[PDB]
Design a protein around this motif. Structure first.
Motif, PDB file in Angstrom:
ATOM      1  N   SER A   1      10.619  -0.259  -9.235  1.00  0.00           N
ATOM      2  CA  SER A   1      11.479  -0.645  -8.233  1.00  0.00           C
ATOM      3  C   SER A   1      12.817   0.030  -8.240  1.00  0.00           C
ATOM      4  CB  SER A   1      11.851  -2.229  -8.744  1.00  0.00           C
ATOM      5  OG  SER A   1      12.717  -2.793  -8.135  1.00  0.00           O
ATOM      6  N   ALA A   2      13.404   0.568  -9.300  1.00  0.00           N
ATOM      7  CA  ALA A   2      14.317   1.445  -9.336  1.00  0.00           C
ATOM      8  C   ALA A   2      14.258   2.691  -8.458  1.00  0.00           C
ATOM      9  CB  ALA A   2      14.710   1.937 -10.688  1.00  0.00           C
ATOM     10  N   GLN A   3      13.064   3.330  -8.794  1.00  0.00           N
ATOM     11  CA  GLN A   3      12.903   4.839  -8.056  1.00  0.00           C
ATOM     12  C   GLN A   3      12.882   4.467  -6.566  1.00  0.00           C
ATOM     13  OE1 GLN A   3       9.513   7.049  -9.402  1.00  0.00           O
ATOM     14  NE2 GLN A   3       9.907   8.719  -7.575  1.00  0.00           N
ATOM     15  N   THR A   4      12.244   3.491  -6.001  1.00  0.00           N
ATOM     16  CA  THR A   4      12.248   3.116  -4.536  1.00  0.00           C
ATOM     17  C   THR A   4      13.406   2.532  -3.984  1.00  0.00           C
ATOM     18  OG1 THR A   4      11.025   1.326  -4.749  1.00  0.00           O
ATOM     19  CG2 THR A   4       9.746   3.400  -4.409  1.00  0.00           C
ATOM     20  N   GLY A   5      14.289   1.725  -4.809  1.00  0.00           N
ATOM     21  CA  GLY A   5      15.035   0.848  -4.274  1.00  0.00           C
ATOM     22  C   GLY A   5      14.635  -0.283  -3.462  1.00  0.00           C
ATOM     23  N   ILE A   6      13.249  -0.803  -3.657  1.00  0.00           N
ATOM     24  CA  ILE A   6      12.666  -1.939  -3.061  1.00  0.00           C
ATOM     25  C   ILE A   6      12.351  -3.003  -4.284  1.00  0.00           C
ATOM     26  CG2 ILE A   6      10.789  -3.091  -1.808  1.00  0.00           C
ATOM     27  CD1 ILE A   6      10.712   0.192  -0.881  1.00  0.00           C
ATOM     28  N   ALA A   7      13.353  -4.290  -4.350  1.00  0.00           N
ATOM     29  CA  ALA A   7      12.980  -5.353  -5.235  1.00  0.00           C
ATOM     30  C   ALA A   7      11.836  -5.811  -5.496  1.00  0.00           C
ATOM     31  CB  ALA A   7      14.134  -6.413  -4.966  1.00  0.00           C
ATOM     32  N   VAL A   8      11.084  -6.008  -6.516  1.00  0.00           N
ATOM     33  CA  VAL A   8       9.874  -6.462  -6.557  1.00  0.00           C
ATOM     34  C   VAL A   8       9.533  -7.735  -5.645  1.00  0.00           C
ATOM     35  CG1 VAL A   8       8.277  -7.662  -8.559  1.00  0.00           C
ATOM     36  CG2 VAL A   8       9.559  -5.461  -9.202  1.00  0.00           C
ATOM     37  N   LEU A   9      10.554  -8.820  -5.879  1.00  0.00           N
ATOM     38  CA  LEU A   9      10.078  -9.608  -4.685  1.00  0.00           C
ATOM     39  C   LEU A   9      10.199  -9.424  -3.326  1.00  0.00           C
ATOM     40  CD1 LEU A   9       9.680 -11.949  -6.418  1.00  0.00           C
ATOM     41  CD2 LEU A   9      11.983 -11.176  -7.217  1.00  0.00           C
ATOM     42  N   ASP A  10      10.796  -8.120  -2.885  1.00  0.00           N
ATOM     43  CA  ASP A  10      10.700  -7.633  -1.851  1.00  0.00           C
ATOM     44  C   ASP A  10       9.135  -7.112  -1.420  1.00  0.00           C
ATOM     45  OD1 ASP A  10      13.231  -8.150  -1.318  1.00  0.00           O
ATOM     46  OD2 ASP A  10      13.985  -6.459  -0.688  1.00  0.00           O
ATOM     47  N   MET A  11       8.772  -6.467  -2.736  1.00  0.00           N
ATOM     48  CA  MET A  11       7.455  -5.740  -2.552  1.00  0.00           C
ATOM     49  C   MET A  11       6.266  -6.949  -2.335  1.00  0.00           C
ATOM     50  SD  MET A  11       6.042  -3.040  -1.840  1.00  0.00           S
ATOM     51  CE  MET A  11       5.830  -1.554  -2.198  1.00  0.00           C
ATOM     52  N   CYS A  12       6.842  -8.027  -3.128  1.00  0.00           N
ATOM     53  CA  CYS A  12       5.711  -9.278  -3.008  1.00  0.00           C
ATOM     54  C   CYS A  12       5.748  -9.814  -1.786  1.00  0.00           C
ATOM     55  CB  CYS A  12       6.026 -10.132  -3.803  1.00  0.00           C
ATOM     56  SG  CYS A  12       6.097  -9.528  -5.802  1.00  0.00           S
ATOM     57  N   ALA A  13       6.790  -9.871  -0.971  1.00  0.00           N
ATOM     58  CA  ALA A  13       6.991 -10.429   0.457  1.00  0.00           C
ATOM     59  C   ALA A  13       6.087  -9.503   1.302  1.00  0.00           C
ATOM     60  CB  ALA A  13       8.422 -10.462   0.599  1.00  0.00           C
ATOM     61  N   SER A  14       5.876  -8.223   0.911  1.00  0.00           N
ATOM     62  CA  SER A  14       5.144  -7.279   1.796  1.00  0.00           C
ATOM     63  C   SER A  14       3.789  -7.580   1.589  1.00  0.00           C
ATOM     64  CB  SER A  14       5.706  -5.772   1.619  1.00  0.00           C
ATOM     65  OG  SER A  14       6.657  -5.268   2.114  1.00  0.00           O
ATOM     66  N   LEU A  15       3.265  -7.794   0.560  1.00  0.00           N
ATOM     67  CA  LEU A  15       1.948  -8.143   0.212  1.00  0.00           C
ATOM     68  C   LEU A  15       1.529  -9.408   0.614  1.00  0.00           C
ATOM     69  CD1 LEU A  15      -0.599  -7.411  -1.515  1.00  0.00           C
ATOM     70  CD2 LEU A  15       0.569  -8.861  -3.313  1.00  0.00           C
ATOM     71  N   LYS A  16       2.368 -10.472   0.479  1.00  0.00           N
ATOM     72  CA  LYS A  16       2.062 -11.762   1.133  1.00  0.00           C
ATOM     73  C   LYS A  16       1.836 -11.460   2.481  1.00  0.00           C
ATOM     74  CE  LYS A  16       4.735 -15.227   0.424  1.00  0.00           C
ATOM     75  NZ  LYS A  16       5.469 -16.216   0.278  1.00  0.00           N
ATOM     76  N   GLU A  17       2.710 -11.056   3.351  1.00  0.00           N
ATOM     77  CA  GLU A  17       2.312 -10.496   4.720  1.00  0.00           C
ATOM     78  C   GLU A  17       1.213  -9.749   4.766  1.00  0.00           C
ATOM     79  OE1 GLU A  17       4.200 -10.760   8.222  1.00  0.00           O
ATOM     80  OE2 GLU A  17       3.798 -12.496   6.896  1.00  0.00           O
ATOM     81  N   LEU A  18       0.747  -8.910   3.994  1.00  0.00           N
ATOM     82  CA  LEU A  18      -0.485  -8.062   3.905  1.00  0.00           C
ATOM     83  C   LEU A  18      -1.657  -9.127   3.892  1.00  0.00           C
ATOM     84  CD1 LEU A  18       0.000  -4.671   2.221  1.00  0.00           C
ATOM     85  CD2 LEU A  18      -0.718  -5.038   4.482  1.00  0.00           C
ATOM     86  N   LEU A  19      -1.531  -9.772   2.743  1.00  0.00           N
ATOM     87  CA  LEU A  19      -2.815 -10.794   2.787  1.00  0.00           C
ATOM     88  C   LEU A  19      -2.934 -11.597   3.865  1.00  0.00           C
ATOM     89  CD1 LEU A  19      -2.393 -12.325  -0.997  1.00  0.00           C
ATOM     90  CD2 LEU A  19      -3.370 -10.060  -0.406  1.00  0.00           C
ATOM     91  N   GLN A  20      -2.024 -12.145   4.413  1.00  0.00           N
ATOM     92  CA  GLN A  20      -2.260 -13.211   5.813  1.00  0.00           C
ATOM     93  C   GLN A  20      -2.644 -12.488   6.868  1.00  0.00           C
ATOM     94  OE1 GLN A  20       1.278 -16.161   3.885  1.00  0.00           O
ATOM     95  NE2 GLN A  20       1.766 -14.762   5.564  1.00  0.00           N
ATOM     96  N   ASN A  21      -2.203 -11.490   7.223  1.00  0.00           N
ATOM     97  CA  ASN A  21      -2.460 -10.723   8.442  1.00  0.00           C
ATOM     98  C   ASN A  21      -3.248  -9.468   8.452  1.00  0.00           C
ATOM     99  OD1 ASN A  21      -0.169 -12.496   8.893  1.00  0.00           O
ATOM    100  ND2 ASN A  21       1.124 -10.595   8.822  1.00  0.00           N
ATOM    101  N   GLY A  22      -3.765  -8.980   7.079  1.00  0.00           N
ATOM    102  CA  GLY A  22      -4.678  -7.913   7.147  1.00  0.00           C
ATOM    103  C   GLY A  22      -3.520  -6.479   7.331  1.00  0.00           C
ATOM    104  N   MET A  23      -4.622  -5.501   7.644  1.00  0.00           N
ATOM    105  CA  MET A  23      -3.829  -3.991   7.837  1.00  0.00           C
ATOM    106  C   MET A  23      -3.868  -3.609   9.208  1.00  0.00           C
ATOM    107  SD  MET A  23      -4.891  -0.964   4.817  1.00  0.00           S
ATOM    108  CE  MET A  23      -4.661  -1.756   3.153  1.00  0.00           C
ATOM    109  N   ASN A  24      -4.513  -4.408  10.199  1.00  0.00           N
ATOM    110  CA  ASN A  24      -4.322  -4.060  11.553  1.00  0.00           C
ATOM    111  C   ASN A  24      -4.700  -2.671  11.861  1.00  0.00           C
ATOM    112  OD1 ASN A  24      -1.825  -6.709  11.615  1.00  0.00           O
ATOM    113  ND2 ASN A  24      -3.313  -6.329  13.510  1.00  0.00           N
ATOM    114  N   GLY A  25      -5.820  -2.216  11.246  1.00  0.00           N
ATOM    115  CA  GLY A  25      -6.244  -1.092  11.590  1.00  0.00           C
ATOM    116  C   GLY A  25      -5.681   0.326  10.825  1.00  0.00           C
ATOM    117  N   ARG A  26      -4.444  -0.065  10.107  1.00  0.00           N
ATOM    118  CA  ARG A  26      -3.763   0.970   9.658  1.00  0.00           C
ATOM    119  C   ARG A  26      -4.475   1.231   7.868  1.00  0.00           C
ATOM    120  NH1 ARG A  26       2.037  -1.744  11.053  1.00  0.00           N
ATOM    121  NH2 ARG A  26       0.585  -3.422  10.720  1.00  0.00           N
TER     122      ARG A  26
END
Lengths: 306, 306
Positions: free
Chosen positions: B254-279
């Protein structure tokens, strides 16, 4: 059973991993007999990489400048030579741990094992393929230059790769151990375009046979196609064109599974055209092309060394 | 740059890999000092695996029965002991190549490297994770029993896995080096239920941090969620529930990237719900959970051992 990306046992190569420093730039080298092989840009700084004159730069270098470390044994460097992009440092003592070794140039599509080192110390080993555009998708930080790729047969270690630099694109390029680059790359830090990369078709078929041996069989259709007709579909999806030599080397997997090479090609046609329909193969949603027919045979038969 | 699944350098462990034979049943063993560790069902036949009485069978075994091979060295087995599912053999010679070694029991979600051997000879090394249901998906053919899993810290080799048997289901089970099974498995060849498997959430976040470190950034949303609101979504898609200890160990990434862990979790939640969309992410269409936070740190900074 089960099927993982397997890397060769790395012991024979760890005993040859040394650190070489020349000024403020320090990278790895490979210590075989009384010679240490490392990339010739060890004699450059960051600022020297734009347009290096390697001939003149080496001429300003003295053996005292080349700090070669083995663990923390310091090796009296007694000579320097330029073979292509590779710098052979003659040294005082032969490496007592020198394995039986060959220096081999490989082909696009063949795989090797890479021992990742930083400051002369090995950190990891992993399997990778020489892409058809002669790059590798690798794990190299700054300071893993000089890390080598190798294959292992019987008692002999076959050195085929040395890493030199990261490209702007994020991909890696390197030389054989005679210092000749794979692909059109050079040891300058300039804009360097790689080729259009293609998918190693013959690896993909071999990975599909591996999946049949390990139970995943949902992609088998009762079709078949001609080799020349398969390639029409291969070009469209940027797959390498299958040759008869590629069919021939797939023979042994075609024998173990009772699925003709063209039959397996017909399933790959289905796969390129229709996708995976949400399924996986050996737990991967994409088609894998980093296994040679030879690698799969060694993993589905238990081929060993020594 | 680049990010590959890496295995520890296997040299220290290759030097302890022996062949152990008891009749027509032969598997690998681990030679540290004057003891050789191997799975106790080496003293079985195919027909003994259904309901073995290991105590009575061992009593019927004599040291003259245990054929131990190290390269081409034949080792005097001079004693036999049963520690849980592991049979400790005295031998004449201490191993001259004995590394600094530990006997460690690991936890689900932690990863290790496996040196795959057949007939006592090493054939491959690969990185793998202990699933939350205490199985591993491995590359083990018949004759890869006794193959060990390990971690390396500094000079020390941390032995945590010995493989024993393939389940009916196609997955593998094994013990620590004191011989206690990981998970509810036993060394009988019977129907054996595995646990419901889960995805190692904290491993998935660490792999997502790895992806941002290597440039892949499309999955970063400007959303955020609470730990408890993320876990509701974790259950539905069969992810392990994230704990605060898990958040804490992601701190350094979290320190090296400046993305708070909950922020990353919110990205993963979106990832679980919508998939990767071909990326893809690092060239994979699935979410990877075979990297600990510690593994990503060791590759995005270049941690070595020597």
């Amino acid at each position: 059973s089960g099927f993982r990306k397997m890397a060769f046992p790395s012991g024979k190569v760890e005993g040859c991993m040394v650190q070489v420093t020349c000024g403020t730039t320090t990278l790895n080298g490979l210590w075989l007999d009384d010679v240490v092989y490392c990339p010739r840009h060890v004699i450059c700084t960051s600022e020297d990489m734009l347009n290096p004159n390697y001939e003149d730069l080496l001429i300003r270098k003295s053996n005292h400048n080349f700090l070669v470390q083995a663990g923390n044994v310091q090796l009296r460097v007694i000579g320097h030579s330029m073979q292509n992009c590779v710098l052979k440092l003659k040294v005082d003592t032969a490496n007592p741990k020198t394995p039986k070794y060959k220096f081999v140039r490989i082909q696009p599509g063949q795989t090797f094992s890479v021992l990742a080192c930083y400051n002369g110390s090995p950190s990891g080993v992993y399997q990778c393929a020489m892409r058809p555009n002669f790059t590798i998708k690798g794990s190299f930080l700054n300071g893993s230059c000089g890390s080598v790729g190798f294959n292992i047969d019987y008692d002999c270690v076959s050195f085929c790769y040395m890493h030199h630099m990261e490209l702007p694109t994020g991909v890696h390029a390197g030389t054989d151990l005679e210092g000749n680059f794979y692909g059109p790359f050079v040891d300058r830090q300039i804009a360097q375009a790689a080729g259009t990369d293609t998918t190693i078709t013959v690896n993909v078929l071999a990975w599909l046979y591996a999946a049949v041996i390990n139970g995943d069989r949902w992609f088998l259709n009762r079709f078949t196609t001609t080799l020349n007709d398969f390639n029409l579909v291969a070009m469209k999806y940027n797959y390498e064109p299958l040759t008869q030599d590629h069919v021939d080397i797939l023979g042994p997997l075609s024998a173990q599974t009772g699925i003709a090479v063209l039959d397996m090609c017909a399933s790959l046609k289905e796969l390129l055209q229709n996708g995976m329909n949400g399924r996986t193969i050996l737990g991967s949603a994409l088609l894998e092309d980093e296994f040679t027919p030879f690698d799969v045979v060694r993993q589905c038969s238990g081929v060993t060394f020594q």
